[PDB]
Amino acid sequence: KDPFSVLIMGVDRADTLIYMTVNPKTNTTDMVSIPRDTYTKIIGKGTMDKINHSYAFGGTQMTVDTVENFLDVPVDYFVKVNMESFRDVVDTLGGITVNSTFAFSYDGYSFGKGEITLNGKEALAYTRMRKEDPRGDFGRQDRQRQVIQGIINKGANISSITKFGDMFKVVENNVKTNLTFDNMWDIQSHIKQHELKGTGTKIIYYYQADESALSDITKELKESLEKKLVP
């Protein structure tokens, strides 16, 4: 079918936000990571705040509305994961795999560079590391995104109806979604990750996006989401 969009939320509250467009025809995937502190209007209320606080005020629906108004593109589907439960969730699946883009050591483990398989405790540690990541909190957000995408990949590669249903029964408390089967299989792990440019200021830390770069990435995502009507 035709291109759609997915908002990945990692919740604690909504400290990880990855907006992504999928074109299943041209096999393409655009993606942009929204930093936790990004200052914007929270839709439904009458306040501008850190975007990650929208979840604490209106739940999922408020967060998706805030992300839509911020990016000026619609989000069709969402995947919300409670990151504090990574362990349980990754243990309930058969463990997951991540594409670790750089090697480090943390909490007794030494994660190498490449496709590596993680159990629950390893995934939690992989995501809790902060100081030794030269990317800062974009890096931590990227590693949490990696674990969430590994969960998605693992859930999407279950062929057995029974194993999927039992898995779901356990996991649905910590993983919410409105995806279809076809779409979840579409977003399984070419790719185009995006850098949301901006500046952080301390008056009490805030982050504010480059208005102009935001306009550019909104144009990019819009064109990626278009339904072409030709003769």
Side-chain angles (χ1 to χ4, degrees), residues 1-24 26-35 37-40 42-44 46-49 51-52 54-112 114-120 122-129 132-162 164-168 170-191 193-201 203-226 229-231:
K1 220 203 202 167
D2 40 44
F4 60 94
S5 68
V6 182
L7 170 71
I8 297 191
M9 308 165 44
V11 158
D12 265 319
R13 305 272 194 258
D15 291 312
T16 300
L17 309 178
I18 310 290
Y19 175 97
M20 158 181 36
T21 78
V22 188
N23 186 349
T26 73
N27 314 70
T28 41
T29 323
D30 274 79
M31 157 194 288
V32 53
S33 319
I34 311 178
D37 321 290
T38 288
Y39 154 69
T40 190
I42 62 168
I43 311 310
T47 287
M48 300 190 57
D49 214 305
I51 189 166
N52 64 69
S54 69
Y55 185 81
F57 283 145
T60 305
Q61 188 57 46
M62 180 150 295
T63 301
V64 48
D65 279 344
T66 299
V67 168
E68 278 181 315
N69 172 251
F70 176 78
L71 287 169
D72 192 44
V73 286
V75 48
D76 306 319
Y77 305 86
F78 79 97
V79 180
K80 180 187 76 182
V81 177
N82 157 28
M83 304 191 290
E84 302 165 9
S85 292
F86 273 159
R87 180 90 170 284
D88 295 332
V89 174
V90 170
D91 284 341
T92 291
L93 317 161
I96 55 78
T97 82
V98 301
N99 178 35
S100 178
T101 71
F102 87 108
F104 65 94
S105 306
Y106 188 66
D107 201 26
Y109 302 101
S110 99
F111 313 85
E115 304 281 5
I116 57 177
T117 302
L118 266 43
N119 60 25
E122 291 156 7
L124 194 54
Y126 188 76
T127 66
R128 290 223 80 191
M129 185 280 258
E132 302 283 317
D133 191 316
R135 301 164 292 166
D137 286 350
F138 169 83
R140 166 158 201 199
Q141 244 185 266
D142 184 69
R143 290 179 272 110
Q144 287 160 2
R145 171 202 67 83
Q146 284 186 335
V147 155
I148 288 175
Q149 183 74 70
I151 288 170
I152 296 178
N153 290 345
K154 189 79 175 219
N157 262 65
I158 294 175
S159 39
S160 164
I161 295 164
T162 306
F164 187 94
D166 298 326
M167 227 87 126
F168 176 99
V170 168
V171 152
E172 80 177 295
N173 206 32
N174 285 307
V175 175
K176 247 66 176 181
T177 202
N178 67 338
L179 280 165
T180 68
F181 278 104
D182 301 353
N183 291 348
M184 98 173 265
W185 282 323
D186 284 335
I187 75 193
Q188 198 282 335
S189 300
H190 213 323
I191 206 144
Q193 300 131 309
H194 277 338
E195 329 84 354
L196 175 87
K197 316 210 191 298
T199 63
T201 89
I203 64 94
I204 53 176
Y205 173 93
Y206 312 73
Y207 186 81
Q208 298 190 278
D210 184 354
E211 54 287 328
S212 200
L214 198 72
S215 311
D216 306 317
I217 58 73
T218 285
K219 176 173 176 183
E220 162 76 83
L221 300 169
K222 277 211 213 295
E223 153 144 350
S224 81
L225 280 169
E226 289 174 340
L229 314 175
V230 279

